[PDB]
Symmetry: C2
Subunit: 246 residues, 2 copies
């Protein structure tokens, strides 16, 4: 069940942002959103795609184990933060596109296609994903589908070993307090054009005391200065629902 809360639009209008937030307590069967239509609309996943990419890398043995170090060969990378050796967690946390492109190359299109179908991941399209593409038809996923996928991961219910799901889960931890734990992942497809904007994401789940909340946020973005809104708008809505971190 999903309830539209139009009162949640105030956080978007205050920042002059077009976007959607989906928040669910306990399971994907109890959810609220500011916009029902946009909650089901599919968008480029951008770096949020590193979550299934990492599970598939481990399932296929392309990622040898939890402790594999992805060595920097010294060749130029698009972001300075990627020009270094990275663990699987580090590569996910800094959104290291080149590490995941090499994993996707080794997995191959046949196995990547097979696993996106097994995971019910978005439109399950073979194109884009970890690669930059201007194809009209490429991988896209809705905020509702992100919550469903993340709930499956949280419950170790994806078509993958529980061990591999647990490895990716610890790699996604972004805040740890005794009774407050956040797993999350950002994405940003690029500012696009003023008429054809890019998308920014923040997806994850929060374990507060004995409760769990799943969330997925996306927004249209045509100016990179607006990128921090992908965390501040959802953080404000979650604080209004009593989900408050340190």
């Amino acid at each position: 069940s999903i309830t539209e809360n139009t009162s949640w639009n105030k956080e978007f209008s205050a920042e002059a942002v077009n976007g959607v937030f989906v928040l669910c307590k306990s399971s994907s069967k109890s959810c609220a959103t500011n916009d029902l239509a946009r909650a089901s609309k599919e968008y480029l996943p951008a770096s949020t795609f590193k979550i299934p990419n990492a599970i598939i890398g481990l399932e296929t043995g392309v990622i040898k184990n939890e402790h594999q170090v992805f060595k920097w060969d010294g060749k130029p990378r698009a972001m300075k933060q990627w020009e270094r050796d990275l663990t699987l967690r580090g590569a996910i946390q800094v959104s290291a596109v080149p590490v995941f492109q090499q994993i996707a190359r080794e997995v191959g299109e046949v196995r990547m296609q097979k696993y996106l179908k097994k995971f019910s991941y978005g439109n399950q399209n073979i194109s884009g994903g970890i690669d930059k593409s201007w194809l009209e038809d490429q991988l896209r996923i809705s905020a509702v589908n992100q919550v469903e996928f993340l709930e499956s991961l949280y419950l170790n219910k994806l078509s993958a070993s529980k061990e591999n799901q647990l490895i990716v889960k610890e790699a996604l931890v972004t805040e740890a307090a005794p009774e407050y734990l956040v797993h999350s992942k950002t994405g940003f497809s690029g500012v696009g054009t003023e008429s054809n904007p890019g998308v920014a994401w923040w997806v994850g789940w929060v374990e507060k005391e004995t409760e769990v909340y799943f969330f997925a946020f996306n927004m249209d973005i045509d100016n990179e200065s607006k990128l921090p809104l992908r965390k501040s708008i959802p953080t404000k809505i979650m604080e209004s629902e009593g989900i408050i971190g340190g």
Copy 2:
């Protein structure tokens, strides 16, 4: 052989008039340093650090049904108000909820508890004390070196337990999460004891900084709870002197 005594590390102990030991290892237990070789191998009551093997054994035996089990508070008074609430496995470990772990140990039983402490090479492997309060001379005790060996085995998923159960307990131990800085840790305090026979306080864990891993175990004599903060500040100062900063 694998451990060097660094007398310079006594600096932070002398400044606080503390009798204690710090063991720090890089990459593995084969490259370590300590301020006191003798105390590094001396066995002390594990106190709440015993919740680490207790949790693994609880999962291995099925007493802890799964990763998502909620330990319900029966409403009966507990020794600390912070324990008078429902707790997850991570919450119970993070707040050192003794009653939750005593009930787990009761269901596991002495025979199985003993069998697993032998499998894990955990301290003197004594059947007495542990999560239960005892003043027996012959009860469970463990050295800082043995804590590092045990935590290294857990980090590597090399304990005699499923890798799934080792991964569940590892996420429950995360205490700091940054993109390229992750800390797993656990405190313990046996109680103030007496001036002639003092209590022991612990801080044990490991730090993943970029692609490096450091294992650590700290213990100190404590006859006044006002000194408890030193169990974290002394090891933090030594680790910061080695560039391990969070």
